[PDB]
Swiss-Prot record, chain A:
Any further remark recorded for this protein: Present with 51100 molecules/cell in log phase SD medium.
Subunit structure: Component of the large ribosomal subunit (LSU). Mature yeast ribosomes consist of a small (40S) and a large (60S) subunit. The 40S small subunit contains 1 molecule of ribosomal RNA (18S rRNA) and 33 different proteins (encoded by 57 genes). The large 60S subunit contains 3 rRNA molecules (25S, 5.8S and 5S rRNA) and 46 different proteins (encoded by 81 genes).
Function noted in UniProt: Component of the ribosome, a large ribonucleoprotein complex responsible for the synthesis of proteins in the cell. The small ribosomal subunit (SSU) binds messenger RNAs (mRNAs) and translates the encoded message by selecting cognate aminoacyl-transfer RNA (tRNA) molecules. The large subunit (LSU) contains the ribosomal catalytic site termed the peptidyl transferase center (PTC), which catalyzes the formation of peptide bonds, thereby polymerizing the amino acids delivered by tRNAs into a polypeptide chain.
InterPro entries, alphabetized: Ribosomal_eL29
A single GO BP: cytoplasmic translation
Gene assigned in the entry: RPL29
Family of this protein: Belongs to the eukaryotic ribosomal protein eL29 family.
GO MF term list: structural constituent of ribosome
Listed Gene3D superfamilies: 6.10.140.1730
Cellular compartments per GO CC: cytoplasm; cytosol; cytosolic large ribosomal subunit
Species in which this protein is naturally found: Saccharomyces cerevisiae (strain ATCC 204508 / S288c) (Baker's yeast)
Covalent cross-link site, Glycyl lysine isopeptide (Lys-Gly) (interchain with G-Cter in ubiquitin): 51
Protein name: Large ribosomal subunit protein eL29
Chain segments annotated as coiled-coil in the UniProt record: none
Sequence ranges of Basic residues compositional bias: 1-25
Swiss-Prot record, chain B:
Name of the gene: RPL10
The species this protein was found in: Saccharomyces cerevisiae (strain ATCC 204508 / S288c) (Baker's yeast)
Cellular location(s): Cytoplasm
SUPFAM superfamilies reported in the protein's UniProt record: Ribosomal protein L16p/L10e (SSF54686)
GO molecular function terms attached to this record: structural constituent of ribosome
Chain segments carrying region 2 X 15-17 AA approximate repeats: 166-215
UniProt keyword Cell membrane present: no
InterPro entries to which the protein is assigned, alphabetical: Ribosomal_uL16 (IPR047873), Ribosomal_uL16_CS_euk_arc (IPR018255), Ribosomal_uL16_dom (IPR016180), Ribosomal_uL16_euk_arch (IPR001197), Ribosomal_uL16_sf (IPR036920)
Protein name, as recorded: Large ribosomal subunit protein uL16
Domain of life: Eukaryota
Curated annotation (Swiss-Prot), chain D:
Protein name per UniProt: Large ribosomal subunit protein eL42A
Subunit structure: Component of the large ribosomal subunit (LSU). Mature yeast ribosomes consist of a small (40S) and a large (60S) subunit. The 40S small subunit contains 1 molecule of ribosomal RNA (18S rRNA) and 33 different proteins (encoded by 57 genes). The large 60S subunit contains 3 rRNA molecules (25S, 5.8S and 5S rRNA) and 46 different proteins (encoded by 81 genes).
Provenance organism: Saccharomyces cerevisiae (strain ATCC 204508 / S288c) (Baker's yeast)
Family: Belongs to the eukaryotic ribosomal protein eL42 family.
Magnesium recorded as keyword: no
A Pfam entry, by short name: Ribosomal_L44
UniProtKB/Swiss-Prot annotation, chain E:
Protein name: Eukaryotic translation initiation factor 5A-1
Function: Translation factor that promotes translation elongation and termination, particularly upon ribosome stalling at specific amino acid sequence contexts. Binds between the exit (E) and peptidyl (P) site of the ribosome and promotes rescue of stalled ribosome: specifically required for efficient translation of polyproline-containing peptides as well as other motifs that stall the ribosome. Acts as a ribosome quality control (RQC) cofactor by joining the RQC complex to facilitate peptidyl transfer during CAT tailing step.
Species per Swiss-Prot/TrEMBL record: Saccharomyces cerevisiae (strain ATCC 204508 / S288c)
Primary localization class, coarse: cytoplasm
Effect seen on changing residue 65 to V: Temperature-sensitive growth phenotype
Gene Ontology MF term list: ribosome binding; RNA binding; translation elongation factor activity; translation initiation factor activity
Modified residues (Phosphoserine): 21
Cellular component terms (Gene Ontology): cytoplasm; cytosol; mitochondrion; perinuclear region of cytoplasm
Note: There are two genes for eIF-5A in yeast.
Record text on subunit structure and interactions: Homodimer. Binds to 80S ribosomes. Actively translating ribosomes show mutually exclusive binding of eIF5a (HYP2 or ANB1) and EFT1/eEF2. Interacts with DYS1 and LIA1.
The gene coding this protein: HYP2
Family according to the record: Belongs to the eIF-5A family.
Shown part of the complete sequence: 54 to 157 of 157
Protein localization: Cytoplasm
RNA sequence: GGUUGCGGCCAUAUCUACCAGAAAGCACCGUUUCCCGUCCGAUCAACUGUAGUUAAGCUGGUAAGAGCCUGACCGAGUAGUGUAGUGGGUGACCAUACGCGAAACUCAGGUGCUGCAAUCU
RNA sequence: GAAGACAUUGUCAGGUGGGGAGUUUGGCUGGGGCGGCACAUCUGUUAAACGAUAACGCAGAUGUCCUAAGGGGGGCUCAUGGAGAACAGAAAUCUCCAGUAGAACAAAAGGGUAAAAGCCCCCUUGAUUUUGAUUUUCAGUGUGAAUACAAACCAUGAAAGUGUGGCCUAUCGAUCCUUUAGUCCCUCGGAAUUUGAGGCUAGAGGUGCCAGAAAAGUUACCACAGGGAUAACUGGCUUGUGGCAGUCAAGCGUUCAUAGCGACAUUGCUUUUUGAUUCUUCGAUGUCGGCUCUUCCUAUCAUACCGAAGCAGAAUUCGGUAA
RNA sequence: GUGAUUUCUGCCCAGUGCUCUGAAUGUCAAAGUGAAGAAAUUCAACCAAGCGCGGGUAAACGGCGGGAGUAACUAUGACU
RNA sequence: GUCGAAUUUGGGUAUAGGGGCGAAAGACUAAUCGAACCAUCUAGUAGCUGGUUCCUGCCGAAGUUUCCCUCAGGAUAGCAGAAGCUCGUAUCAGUUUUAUGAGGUAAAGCGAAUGAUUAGAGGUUCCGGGGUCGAAAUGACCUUGACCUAUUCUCAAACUUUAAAUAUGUAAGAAGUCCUUGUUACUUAAUUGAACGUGGACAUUUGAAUGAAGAGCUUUUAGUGGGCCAUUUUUGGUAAGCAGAACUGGCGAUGCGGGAUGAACCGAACGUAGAGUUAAGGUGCCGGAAUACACGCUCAUCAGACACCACAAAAGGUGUUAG
């Protein structure tokens, strides 16, 4: 009572029925996993930039 | 006792030679591979003929044995034992597997089928191609008729079609008759006990000088 | 039974080279990697630390992170009927710039310079590349080059 | 295996916060006590008829047990513990191994 | 199916025991060891033994077995008593007596 | 151009046997009180630069040199291979059409280049 | 009459109790069972030069071991061969020359390693703490293993650095419950203190059928659901095995290969042997053999007619046309 | 349990059961006893039967082996 | 068979279902017995067989991944429909080109590492076994073997210097490039760097080809989880219409013309009709279509006649034909 065990038949067709579309792209990708020491700087850096621009445009 | 040869006529599996992984093989029937006046010089046997394959098959060591024995014995009986140099050009290195099964009446109680049907070695064979030489013979031009007939009588032991060809080369060298002749009349050919060495244009000069002296003695 | 380790079936893939074993020449570490560089991955069997898994052999990605002695890379892997982005951490040894961009930026800067110098006389710079056009008409003379006639060859055994 | 009877290690004793000396002792179970919720519930269920009511384990397969060390700071007097891989033989008091000697 | 019936003798008591199991039950296999100790002067009913290095084992107590009596007899003239010890799951006793009276 | 220190590329840079090497530099070279290490100032440590020698190291050249590197309509459009046919052959296998295309082999050529700093008849 | 605060009787407690009750008695599988584990894994190959890829395929391995065989630093260079030194020899120890690894690196194999990853010596415990991120198997869950940072405390080295166990690829484990360490933190709900109990964070006690039920047999007295997804007959494919026939010629045959034989080889044929598979039938095709009865096949035992012989006749052998 | 009569019913009690021992450093529940604690409780010592240990039992269940050398032809093996 | 007794038998009475009764068969207990009959719990449970009642229109599948005492079953992912939503030529594409990576298969090599393997040739023994000359000699001669040197014949899935075609990663711009100078607790000897910005400059030739039937997004749920065949690559086996994989196309789910006949082959996929032209196949007749044209071969006392496909070989022939 054996049973045919494994094969990839028709898998390619079954996949390509719907696209293998590229994942996506964006401005401003996720920052998870980047060097936290760098993140800590970068946050205060933007903070300072924004404050300076607000005070200048005031 | 021996399964008929038609069960191993083709090349059906990848080469499976004896090695540290096989470790249990029988011995090929063929042990003597060069026959005749093998200590002959290069230059006394200019004529050379080949028994060439025209197929793609496997040859049993037993078949090689039978052909070698028949051809050698004829060549001796007619032309004298020292009128030729005969050589095989293949070697049985492919092991042939067999799945030994019980052959008694009522073995249905014991045989176990192909469940776990890996084979067991029982015979050697050599794989041969289209255009590959099997037998090579060299002798004097006066014996072309006898040697070619010996080879023809030999083909009958091999399965399939094989031709007999008269090589335009001198002896077993890689040279044709006139080229070898001129090269030998010039000094750059020095015989060895069985084969011959060739003076090259490269190498350390004095080392070339110590041999081949007459060539430089121009 | 069956077997799938972390480094299975890599016996040839990870061999170093012929005649190139031993330490690594320093240029590799003297390289400098910026965020956004496009980089190829070639494993180096001498440094077991921070290797890439065999699947990422020979692939190409974009750097996104930099640390004291390693690099973060982004790869797109085809699993099932979509692509998923994987993030890798690799020591600088299995890494080298893909000079595709190195040459591409050359084209871009030369392109801009060409556009500007052409605009200096307003002459329709004609930027885009072209595939290999079919070759043009031409005349062939036979002076000292009389046509030579061939013919097929007969047959002999050549042995 | 062989493990020293003393060891210097980080000790989170609210006073130490730095590597300090540590005696080592091997973990022991500690006597199983009654009145625990599990045991007393189990006794209540075992009461009356019905016989055995919770499963009992039979198919022992492992032959070893992970060994667990019991560390204490010699200064702060707090107990910390950590584990080691499996080993059929364990030993704290160790005659430190030597190379030059023969069989 | 296929089952197993086996008879095995106790190591230490010497009594005879037997049982049968289906050929899937995996009852415990004890671990034993032979150590090749040396005997010093025989004190009271205890035994006084020798490692290759140490002076330990005031243990198994001079086996009362009849080979033990033969050992006790052959002791009083000396000639380099060698013994072995079986220590299956703690409960241990000397089983074999042997001699290498060479000291050369 | 020579030489030294720090290098990049990692043999065109290695190996085998010979021959030459101004000046400087490098080197071998002298000594053991101190720091220091050894079974032993051989290595390593320290001091002198004075007592000597280019013998060796090093550099360069030499070889129908091994090796190594490069190239070639030399081998070969062969071996191999993607695609096609109601093509051949009993078969093993093989031609044919549109495509891609080796290695060995043979021949010819070559035997370190180069960055930073200092010094040299 | 007998017996007497003992028996008996009531309730708990330990013992005995297939006489009786209930229940179970793994999976894979060239039918099932015995066998083995392909039941969780690791190396190389089968694997068709990315990836992934099956078989009871091939060659093997794991359920360990290690306070150093970890970490750092320093010094040195191996297997082997040649030439020498009292006893000393094929082998003891010493010295020189050669030596790209031909050795060693816990273990199987495969990678990797030469002023080291090897050998020897010195100091140590980073085999630590706090929780994240990522890679492999993948559902992009868990477990296992690993990688790159962050925040402390460390070891080593002069230093740059290196170190979150073993040079890399295998060496291992959920819910409930018990137990241990931490906070000395929360709660015991009428209000308090002290015991006791329950909680939060982090480990250990094992589930090898290894994503984890607690489990002994027999039925030929048997039963039910089903299965041709699967066995024993026939039938179909294959021809090892069985049977039959050639090609070759070393010899046998007194001499001489073929009058007749015929070794070592090799090409076929047949389905009357026995295997091999599982295509059809398990809402049933009545399964050995004998008895009786018809036709068919030819690889001919006899009969007819021929050919050949190591055929005088006699007798016999081989062959052809032939059912 | 065996199965007219006649004639005989051999050896083994190691195993499994049955039975009989209990002088005893063996083991033990509930009750009770002692100690600690404010108490819940904890820890001790003590114990009946049974089992452990020791005899009997086969017309009870049942069982009743190997290997070597040896005698004047050989051969075998009384024998060891 | 037995017939004077353990004989046969009427009526009364006794024994009631896990019970009775048994000169013992698992027999008998109202045709029912290895657990009687009647009613009820009860429409008991079913991973298993059987059926499942109107028309048309539109779209349109899987027999595969992972886990499960899972193997005839589920969950999960995959394949499908439906509902739509945000926008309007794009952040696209089973495609090629250009540029740049990665790979150890086919092939090839062994006078290149590892391993195997035939033959002579030249040396070499303070050293192999010997023999001959010798009392022995580190004395001579032959022999065998070894060892070394240069050659030679042949091989590899678990060997390899080299190394294809086919497959495969990334890029070909506005989310760009250049210029100036702002921020930071990060980093630098240092306004050095890093990262993000301010401001300014550069457009349809804004950065190869071709196409784009619109592009992107979300839910929710049915069926499915036994596959099979063909070419090519390929494993076990002698093989099989066998078992097991890789890529693609089919069959299942599909009719139509052809292969007589058939699920897979060849052509080609289908609303309903008319006309014309073709495919694959054919054109003596059955049968619509040239007993067309042309050069040659072959006579069979078992001719031959079309792929998949329904089979024939080794060896022979003054048959015949051309070399
Ligand atoms: Mg499987
Ligand atoms: Mg490589
Ligand atoms: Mg109660
Ligand atoms: Mg109770
Ligand atoms: Mg086609
Ligand atoms: Mg029962
Ligand atoms: Mg089963
Ligand atoms: Mg692959
Ligand atoms: Mg180590
Ligand atoms: Mg070091
Ligand atoms: Mg995971
Ligand atoms: Mg650190
Ligand atoms: Mg590590
Ligand atoms: Mg646990
Ligand atoms: Mg708890
Ligand atoms: Mg499991
Ligand atoms: Mg039962
Ligand atoms: Mg039955
Ligand atoms: Mg069937
Ligand atoms: Mg059968
Ligand atoms: Mg046959
Ligand atoms: Mg046969
Ligand atoms: Mg038949
Ligand atoms: Mg059948
Ligand atoms: Mg049936
Ligand atoms: Mg029927
Ligand atoms: Mg019928
Ligand atoms: Mg006939
Ligand atoms: Mg009590
Ligand atoms: Mg008692
Ligand atoms: Mg019965
Ligand atoms: Mg009845
Ligand atoms: Mg119903
Ligand atoms: Mg399970
Ligand atoms: Mg199903
Ligand atoms: Mg069904
Ligand atoms: Mg599902
Ligand atoms: Mg589903
Ligand atoms: Mg490979
Ligand atoms: Mg090949
Ligand atoms: Mg090659
Ligand atoms: Mg090799
Ligand atoms: Mg590509
Ligand atoms: Mg539905
Ligand atoms: Mg299935
Ligand atoms: Mg169907
Ligand atoms: Mg169709
Ligand atoms: Mg029409
Ligand atoms: Mg008509
Ligand atoms: Mg002819
Ligand atoms: Zn502390």
């Amino acid at each position: 009572a054996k049973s045919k065990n494994h094969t990839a038949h028709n898998q390619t067709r079954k996949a390509h029925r719907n696209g293998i579309k590229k994942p996506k792209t964006y401005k401003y990708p996720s920052l998870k996993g980047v060097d936290p020491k760098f993140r800590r700087n970068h946050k205060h850096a933007l903070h300072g930039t924004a404050k300076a621009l607000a005070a200048a445009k005031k | 006792a021996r399964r008929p040869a038609r069960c191993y006529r083709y090349q059906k599996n990848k080469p499976y030679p004896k090695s540290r992984y096989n470790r249990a093989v029988p011995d090929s029937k063929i042990r003597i591979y060069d026959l005749g006046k093998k200590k002959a010089t290069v230059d006394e046997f200019p004529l050379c003929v080949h028994l060439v394959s025209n197929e793609l098959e496997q040859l049993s060591s037993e078949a090689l044995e039978a052909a070698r024995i028949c051809a050698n014995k004829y060549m001796t009986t007619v032309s004298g034992r020292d009128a030729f140099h005969l050589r095989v050009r293949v070697h049985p290195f492919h092991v042939l597997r067999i799945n030994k099964m019980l052959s008694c009446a009522g073995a249905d109680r014991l045989q176990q089928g192909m469940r776990g049907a890996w084979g067991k070695p029982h015979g050697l064979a050599a794989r041969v191609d289209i255009g590959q030489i099997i037998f090579s013979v060299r002798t004097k031009d006066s014996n072309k008729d006898v040697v070619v007939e010996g080879l023809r009588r030999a083909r009958y032991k091999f399965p399939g079609q094989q031709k007999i060809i008269l090589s335009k080369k001198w002896g077993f060298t890689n040279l044709d008759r006139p080229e070898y002749l001129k090269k030998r009349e010039a000094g750059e050919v020095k015989d060895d006990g069985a084969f011959v060495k060739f003076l090259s244009k490269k190498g350390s000069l004095e080392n070339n000088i110590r041999e081949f002296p007459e060539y430089f003695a121009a | 039974g069956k077997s799938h380790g972390y480094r299975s079936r890599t016996r040839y893939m990870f061999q170093r080279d012929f005649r190139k074993h031993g330490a690594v020449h320093l240029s590799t570490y003297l390289k400098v990697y910026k965020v956004g560089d496009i980089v190829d991955i070639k494993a180096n069997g001498s440094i077991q630390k921070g290797m890439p898994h065999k699947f990422y052999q020979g692939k190409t990605g974009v750097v996104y992170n930099v640390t004291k002695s390693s690099v973060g890379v982004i790869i797109n892997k085809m699993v099932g009927n979509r692509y998923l982005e994987k993030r890798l951490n690799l020591r600088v040894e299995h890494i080298k710039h893909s000079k595709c961009r190195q040459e591409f930026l050359e084209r871009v800067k030369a392109n801009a310079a060409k556009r500007a110098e052409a605009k200096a006389q307003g002459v329709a710079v004609q930027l885009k590349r072209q595939p290999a056009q079919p070759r043009e008409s031409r005349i062939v003379s036979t002076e000292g080059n009389v046509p030579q006639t061939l013919a097929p060859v007969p047959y002999e055994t050549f042995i | 295996v062989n493990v020293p009877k003393t060891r210097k290690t980080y000790c989170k004793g609210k006073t130490c916060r730095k590597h300090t000396q540590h005696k080592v002792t091997q973990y022991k179970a500690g006597k199983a006590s009654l009145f625990a919720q599990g045991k007393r519930r189990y006794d209540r269920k075992q009461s009356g008829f019905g016989g055995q009511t919770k499963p009992v384990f039979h198919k022992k397969a492992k032959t070893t047990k992970k060994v667990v060390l019991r560390l204490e700071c010699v200064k702060c007097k707090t107990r910390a513990q950590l584990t080691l891989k499996r080993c059929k033989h364990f030993e704290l008091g160790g005659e430190k191994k030597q190379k030059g000697q023969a069989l | 199916h296929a089952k197993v019936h086996l008879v095995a003798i106790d190591i230490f008591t010497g009594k005879k025991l037997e049982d049968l199991s289906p050929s899937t039950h995996n009852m415990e296999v004890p671990v034993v060891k032979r150590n090749e100790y040396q005997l010093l002067d025989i004190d009271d009913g205890f035994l006084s033994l020798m490692n290759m290095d140490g002076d330990t084992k005031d243990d198994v107590k001079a086996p009362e077995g009849e080979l033990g009596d033969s050992l006790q007899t052959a002791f009083d003239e000396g000639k380099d008593l060698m013994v072995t010890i079986i220590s299956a799951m703690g409960e241990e006793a000397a089983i074999s007596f042997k001699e290498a009276a060479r000291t050369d």
